[PDB]
Amino acid sequence: DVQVTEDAVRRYLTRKPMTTKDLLKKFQTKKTGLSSEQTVNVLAQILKRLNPERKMINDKMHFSLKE
């Protein structure tokens, strides 16, 4: 079984800045097992718990964490 955790999303943020929309699709390419709707609810709650920072790149809003 495959599950989504804060560490998963945080891993991407630490590497490169990504947007909320990008994060969603990020968990679409790989078979998560859970419905797309479920990912939205979890992704929306997970992000809040992680409390990622907000950055403006190329006139766009992106999220990036600084370990």
Side-chain angles (χ1 to χ4, degrees), residues 6-50:
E6 293 181 282
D7 189 85
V9 185
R10 184 181 191 161
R11 189 272 193 194
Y12 298 96
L13 295 170
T14 58
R15 289 295 189 79
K16 50 194 263 217
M18 298 186 75
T19 73
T20 53
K21 185 182 186 217
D22 295 342
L23 292 175
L24 181 75
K25 295 182 73 76
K26 187 78 249 190
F27 293 102
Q28 292 294 318
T29 306
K30 296 181 70 167
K31 189 183 182 158
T32 58
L34 304 183
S35 301
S36 187
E37 187 69 24
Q38 297 298 320
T39 304
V40 186
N41 294 343
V42 185
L43 188 144
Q45 295 178 339
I46 209 150
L47 288 170
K48 290 183 183 97
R49 185 73 181 80
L50 187 71

